[PDB]
Symmetry: none
Subunit: 158 residues, 2 copies
């Protein structure tokens, strides 16, 4: 099992970490959502799908920087919604093909009432999403740590 | 502060996520209302009511699946009606008792004019409702994310 990002980088068999940059709506009002859909950027596959089933969870989602201080949010994983930052490891998604399949994670972030001005700075760390992968064959239990960075400033009008 | 569901589960202190399975009227004609009353399903309480006031909002209500596609509606929160899907956080409801009390949320949904046949599929996600809880004591600010599923098909007759 391993993962890659679109025109990006890879995390090899056995896990590891990578940095992922996201484009954000440059202006978001209180009451609106910034939707950060990682399913178009992070893809994973099963290396032995004929004999082994891989199981993949969102182990944890954490907020950093301007997202931690200026937004409230939720994360959607494979059709289910959760608080972000997360409070538990999600149920598992099965990976059963060598064909790259999206990791179905999206953040829905909305400004808190105190946000104003530049609420997320370009280039800054905004989140960490930890993917945990196991299987039905051996003791493999690996973390794929995705450090999420903003491409651009996000302004909350005042 | 924590919450529970009818014959169900709990989301404990600090928030989290749960699934709520609801029985829906099996037949709703164009021109009739489908009512999804969560006040009979979701109940919450304040853990220190002698010294602390808990404040609870519907931060956001989102529609999915057949409700998103085939119905238009509003949401009623503690006696006032708002658009659904929602466009802003509601006013606060006070929780001031240790006894579990309803979360006073109901969806009032009516089929769109072109809807017919199976308009909501049994087992499908129909809504996500975010309960946001704060207090007048400390910095606690917690989300309770309710994933709402239909237990049965809803047919719009033709
Ligand atoms: Ni491979
Ligand atoms: Ni209690």
């Amino acid at each position: 099992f391993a993962c890659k990002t679109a025109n990006g980088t890879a995390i090899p068999i056995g896990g590891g970490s990578a940095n992922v940059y996201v484009n954000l709506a440059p202006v978001v009002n209180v009451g609106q959502n910034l939707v950060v859909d990682l399913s178009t950027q992070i893809f994973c596959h099963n290396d032995y799908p004929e004999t082994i089933t891989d199981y993949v969870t969102l182990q944890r989602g954490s907020a950093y920087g301007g997202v931690l201080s200026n937004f409230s949010g939720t994360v959607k994983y494979s059709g289910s919604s959760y608080p972000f930052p997360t409070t538990s490891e999600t149920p598992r998604v099965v990976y059963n093909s060598r064909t790259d399949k999206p990791w179905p994670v999206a953040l829905y972030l909305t400004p808190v009432s105190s946000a104003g001005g530049v609420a997320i700075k370009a280039g800054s760390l905004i989140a960490v999403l930890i993917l945990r992968q196991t299987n039905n064959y051996n003791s493999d239990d690996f973390q794929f740590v995705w450090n999420i960075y903003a491409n651009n400033d996000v302004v909350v009008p005042t």
